[PDB]
Amino acid sequence: STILFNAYKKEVFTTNTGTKSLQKRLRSNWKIQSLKDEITSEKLIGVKLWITAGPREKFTAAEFEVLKKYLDSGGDILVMLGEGGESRFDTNINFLLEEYGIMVNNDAVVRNVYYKYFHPKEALVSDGVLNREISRAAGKAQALTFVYPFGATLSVMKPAVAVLSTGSVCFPLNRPILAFYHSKNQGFGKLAVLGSCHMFSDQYLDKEENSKIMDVVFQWLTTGDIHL
Numbered sequence: 757s758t759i760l761f762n763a764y765k766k767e768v769f770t771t772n773t774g775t776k777s778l779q780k781r782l783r784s785n786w787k788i789q790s791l792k793d794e795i796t797s798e799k800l801i802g803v804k805l806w807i808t809a810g811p812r813e814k815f816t817a818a819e820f821e822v823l824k825k826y827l828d829s830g831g832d833i834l835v836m837l838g839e840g841g842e843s844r845f846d847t848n849i850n851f852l853l854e855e856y857g858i859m860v861n862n863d864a865v866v867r868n869v870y871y872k873y874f875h876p877k878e879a880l881v882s883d884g885v886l887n888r889e890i891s892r893a894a895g896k897a898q899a900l901t902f903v904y905p906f907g908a909t910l911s912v913m914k915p916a917v918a919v920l921s922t923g924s925v926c927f928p929l930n931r932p933i934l935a936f937y938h939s940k941n942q943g944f945g946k947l948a949v950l951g952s953c954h955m956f957s958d959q960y961l962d963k964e965e966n967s968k969i970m971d972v973v974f975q976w977l978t979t980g981d982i983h984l
Contacts, residue, residue, distance in 0.1 A: 758787045758802040759978075761809065764794070765847070768838070769809030769953055777958040778970065785978075795822045805832040805977055810953035811847045820852050827945040832977045836953040839864040839877060841908040856937045857916040858949045861909050865933070865951075868925045879904045880964070881923040884933065887984045890919055892975070893968040903964045904933065907952025915939045916947075917984065920969075936976065936984070946977055 759782055763770035771779060771790040779788050786804070793799075800806065806826070827833055835853065837845050841862035850859050866876040873880065881904050885891060893900060904922070909931040912918040918932035937947040954960060956970055976982040 757804055758789055759805045759807065760789060760791050760800070760803045761807045762795075762811070763790045764792050765808065765811040765813040765815070767809050767811055769957060774953075774957050775809055777961050778956050781970075782974075795819050797822050797825055800826050800831060803831060805834060807834045808836065808849070809956075810837050810845065811835075811849055812845055814846070814848045815852065817851075823852065824855075827947060828940075828942040830943055830945055832946045832948075834948045834950070834973075834977060836950040836956075837908070838952045838954060839906045839908055853947075853949055856947055857913040858935045858937070858947075859911045860949065860951060861911055863908055863928070865904055865907050865909060865922050865926050865928070868927070873903070875906075877906045878960075879907070879922070879926045881921075881926050883925075884921045884923040885919075886921055886932075887917075887919045889982065889984055890972055892972050892982055893965075900968065901964050902966045902969050903955070903960050904952060905954040905960050907933065907950075907955065909933055910935050910949060910951050916949075919984070934973070944979070946979070948973060948977055 761771050769775045841860045843862040864877050865879045867879045882901050885900050912932040912935045916935045916937045918935050920934035921930050922933055933951040935949050
């Protein structure tokens with residue numbers, strides 16, 4: 757029972773920065789601690805979830821093994837990087853995700869028409885929920901708006917499964933944006949890649965039913981009454 761934000765890879769959001777408002781909703785059920793030194797399989801001992809909010813330094817094949825072990829051990833991981841993907845972020849995180857069928861592309865999602873927000877990349881997505889059960893908030897068969905700021909789209913193929921899309925009014929249209937991996941009886945290791953680290957920051961989490969989305973992404977990671 758500890759949630760671990762990674763911070764030595766020059767992450768964009770660490771516990772010192774950024775995801776300040778996200779922590780308040782987690783320090784309720786968890787012990788949030790940052791990570792400053794190299795990832796050692798022992799270090800991740802208590803950890804229920806490891807998080808990288810927008811890494812910007814490369815990873816070492818040594819560090820990767822540390823994580824694939826940790827994921828097959830029943831650990832959980834959450835990787836979020838942003839607009840422009842690995843080509844604006846200078847990090848080799850894809851080498852790890854490529855094994856689970858997820859790969860963060862290098863493009864930015866934009867809006868169709870101006871509403872509420874300054875920048876074109878502050879994309880507002882009305883019908884992006886893909887799995888029905890992810891309406892673990894209300895609605896069934898109503899909509900769910902979230903603000904998808906400064907983000908890239910994911911290439912998702914099995915075994916991973918896409919669960920949020922850019923929608924029908926953002927561009928690229930209908931391309932995956934959040935992907936999950938539960939597979940195998942490892943048992944029950946869980947990975948979740950999000951196409952943008954900003955979606956959960958203080959700047960946007962409060963704003964547009966992003967908060968319900970967070971709740972669900974974290975109940976699936978931190979399982980959780982969620983089953984696709």
